[PDB]
Design a protein around this nucleic acid. Structure first.
Ligand code: MG
Length: 637
DNA sequence: TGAGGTAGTAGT
RNA sequence: ACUACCUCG
């Protein structure tokens, strides 16, 4: 399975000696910014200065003659108005080899690209985006299509051009006109003079000088989700097609040479052997076939509508599943209503006492906040719950079948397990509570084996805490849970993190896995930024592994339709001595272990996928000590 | 709340 | 994160 592919990266000309050694300016601000506003300002100064200049260190580097740049002037930020000055401390050499420096060069590259689009006649430009054609139209509205662009500097002092087809929605109507016809509100609006997106509160029932003002000078709402249905995406061949063009058109007016598509060797990883009681292609099939390992169960039904017992096909469905499945279950019906107060609560008490592992709630669509309340409630009483909206016909097969898969997972049932041998016996994923680092908590889920998966929540608080400890705590708890549920501590773990947050935040975490004598591989997953992958000949397979530079690579976990193009994940092996194929192979296999869908695997590997849902759910509900629940009950899916 | 994917949105 | 477009023996 060795194929060759194109990347939406285009190789260009090697950076000359002047571009490698940009000018270095010193920056003097009055009054002194302050530790965390200085960087934003320098950036905001690089823009004022003009030319191809970006921020480098505490002052900026440039590619435009220091003479042509605006050396003095003023600017405002968060209230304060500052005065700036620039003093040209010569040319400083940058080394593409040095990642840090390779970053100052790359920046200038974006500024350069951004300056060239700025001067393009007859073309719409928005940031680094350029729309060169009209794709759609209609009543005072239209879609322009082009490509989001990017220009960075190679690891070998060369230029790189990234291209990716994109669409742009533009309102042809004006603020009034729009409001006219009978259109609701617009969150953003941009002047008809300068494209300054703006947050408008509403129409000002005010005065009539405001008019003279504009009149003296001689002198439209931005849209998002205000469009009637008469397809935003593109199929890979078409966006592979539009890429080549747009790239050949743009490169043809940047004066850096012919863009040369960068080829790369890929590999078709092995198909995952997904297993229930018998082989199974998608988790749903476990319902007809039978689960891998299935404990007895006891499920409760909570009807919040008018009806009474279990809709027969549901009773059947289950009874048929546990049938082919090893053990058998026992249904239950809660005879209380959330309003019944202590009555209802005491009911959950009996429900959990009498065995019940998870409740299935049949109810008309629930207003967001009512939903969260019921779930938190049932949850404190230690009962995970699956909601299935009531208007339900038995041909809505797919919908109630997911509800069931959820119910079961919420009950702690191992729907399907992966048949085979893998490097890490335990793969745990972490997702942060504070976006940029685990300084403000986070969560983590793992998948092992038997083949059982579980979840973990940070040691209670609110208030900062050394990231690394927060992180080791997450891994520490996960290891424990794995013992009391399998009896044995894994010999090799696979740590998956969302890449955004730094890395050494896992340092102490690794230190411990060291002392505790246990193997490990630390891999970072980035959902976006892995460009695109198009084969040169043949079709686009699923499960493609494409090694890039040192220890980083692109994996394509899915390709489930021919009306869109897949978005490969980028992965970087930052620790461990396991061969990249073994990793890719395991990461690509952990994609079939998500139990809540059952008709389509998620793009990410289940450990990271479950991590995020556990976090969003921890926020949506108000979990602090949801610790009455067994860690193998996926209450958050 | 069925869930997944790819898309877009994220001086006057 | 939110919304739309699909789609799911
Ligand atoms: Mg669910």
């Amino acid at each position: 399975g060795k194929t060759e592919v194109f990347l939406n990266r285009f190789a260009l000309r090697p950076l000359n000696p002047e571009e490698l050694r940009p000018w270095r300016l010193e920056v003097v601000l009055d009054p002194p910014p302050g530790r965390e506003e200085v960087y934003p300002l320098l950036a905001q100064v690089a823009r004022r200065a003009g030319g191809v200049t970006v921020r480098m260190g505490d002052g900026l580097a440039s590619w435009s003659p220091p003479e042509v740049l605006v050396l003095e002037g003023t600017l405002a930020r968060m209230g304060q108005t500052y005065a700036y000055r620039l003093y040209p401390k010569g040319r400083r050499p940058l080394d593409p080899k040095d990642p840090g420096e390779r970053s100052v060069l790359s920046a200038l590259a974006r500024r350069l690209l951004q300056e060239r689009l700025r001067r393009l006649e007859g073309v719409w430009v928005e940031g680094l985006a350029v729309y060169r054609r009209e794709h759609a139209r209609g009543p005072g509205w239209r879609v322009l299509g082009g490509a989001v662009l990017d220009l960075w500097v190679s690891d070998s002092g060369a230029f790189l051009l990234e291209v990716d087809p994109a669409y742009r929605i533009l309102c042809e109507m004006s603020l009034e006109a729009w409001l006219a016809q009978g259109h609701p509100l617009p969150k953003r609006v941009r002047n008809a003079y300068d494209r300054r997106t703006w947050e408008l509160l509403r129409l000002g029932e005010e005065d009539p000088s405001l008019l003279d003002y504009h009149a003296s000078k001689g002198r439209v709402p931005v849209l998002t989700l205000e469009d009637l249905h008469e397809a935003l995406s593109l199929p890979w061949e078409e966006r592979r097609r539009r890429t080549r063009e747009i790239a050949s058109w743009i490169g043809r007016r940047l004066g850096l040479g012919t863009p040369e598509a960068v080829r790369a060797q890929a590999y078709r990883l092995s198909i995952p052997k997904l297993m229930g009681r018998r082989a199974v292609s998608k988790p749903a099939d476990a319902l007809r076939v039978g689960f891998y390992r299935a404990q007895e169960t006891a499920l409760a039904l909570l009807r919040l509508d008018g009806a009474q017992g279990w809709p027969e096909f549901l009773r059947r469905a289950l009874l048929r599943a546990f049938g082919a499945s090893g053990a058998s279950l026992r249904l239950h019906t809660l005879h209380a209503h959330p309003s019944q107060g202590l009555a209802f609560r005491e009911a959950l008490r009996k429900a959990k006492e009498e065995g019940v592992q998870a409740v299935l709630v049949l109810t008309p669509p629930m207003a967001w906040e009512d939903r969260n309340r019921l779930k938190a409630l049932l949850l404190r009483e230690g009962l995970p719950s699956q909601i299935l909206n009531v208007p339900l016909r038995e041909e809505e097969r797919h919908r109630w079948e997911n509800a069931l898969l959820g119910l079961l997972a919420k009950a702690g049932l191992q729907v399907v397990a992966l048949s085979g041998a893998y490097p890490a016996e335990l793969a745990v994923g972490f997702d942060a509570g504070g976006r940029e680092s685990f300084r403000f908590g986070g969560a983590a889920c793992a998948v092992g084996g038997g083949g059982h998966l579980l979840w973990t929540l940070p040691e209670a608080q609110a208030g900062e805490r050394i990231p690394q400890e927060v992180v080791w705590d997450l891994l520490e708890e996960t290891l424990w849970a794995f013992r009391r549920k399998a009896g044995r501590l894994p010999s090799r773990v696979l740590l998956l993190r969302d890449g955004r947050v730094p890395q050494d935040e896992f340092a102490l975490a690794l230190e411990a896995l060291a002392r505790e004598g246990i193997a490990y591989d630390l891999v970072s997953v980035r959902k976006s930024g892995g460009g695109r992958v198009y084969p040169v000949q043949g079709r686009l397979a699923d499960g493609l592994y494409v090694p890039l530079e040192d220890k980083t690579f692109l994996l394509l976990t899915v390709h489930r339709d021919f009306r869109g193009t897949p978005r490969p994940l980028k992965l970087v092996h930052e620790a461990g001595d396991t061969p990249l194929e073994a990793l890719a192979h395991q990461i690509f296999h952990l994609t079939r272990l998500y139990p809540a869908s059952g008709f389509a695997f998620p793009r990410l590997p289940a450990p990271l996928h479950l991590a995020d849902r556990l976090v969003k759910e921890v926020g949506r509900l108000g979990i602090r000590h949801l610790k009455e629940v067994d860690r193998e009950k996926l209450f958050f899916v």
